């Protein structure tokens, strides 16, 4: 494939009631990747988004990229399916 992934913590073993997952594309300098930290909350997940990309990328696009990959390999897709863009926090390096 063409991301690379990595994770840290799980729902079942969070890490001080997080867990974390981010998705990336491959060979990116200065790199471009989604990350999306989890927590449980009464009825369901909560979801935060952090986009660390560069300068003059189309943020939007990328976000949105990024954001399928983690739809496919997250554990709670429906809690992530709901962070649209303006909620995204984007670090430009």
């Given at each position: 494939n063409?991301?690379?992934?990595?994770?840290?913590?799980?729902?079942?073993?969070?890490?001080?009631?997080?867990w974390?997952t981010?998705?990336?594309?491959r060979?990116?300098?200065?790199?471009?990747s989604?990350?999306?930290?989890?927590?449980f909350?009464?009825?369901?997940?909560?979801?935060?988004?952090?986009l660390?990309?560069?300068?003059?990328?189309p943020?939007?696009?990328?976000?949105?990229?990024?954001?399928?990959?983690?739809?496919?390999?997250?554990?709670?897709?429906?809690?992530?399916?709901?962070?649209?863009?303006?909620?995204?926090?984007?670090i430009?390096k």
């Amino acid at each position: 494939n063409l991301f690379d992934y990595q994770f840290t913590g799980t729902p079942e073993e969070p890490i001080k009631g997080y867990w974390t997952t981010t998705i990336s594309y491959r060979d990116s300098k200065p790199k471009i990747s989604l990350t999306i930290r989890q927590e449980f909350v009464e009825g369901g997940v909560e979801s935060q988004a952090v986009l660390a990309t560069v300068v003059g990328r189309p943020h939007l696009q990328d976000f949105l990229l990024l954001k399928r990959k983690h739809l496919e390999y997250s554990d709670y897709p429906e809690s992530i399916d709901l962070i649209e863009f303006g909620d995204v926090k984007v670090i430009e390096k």
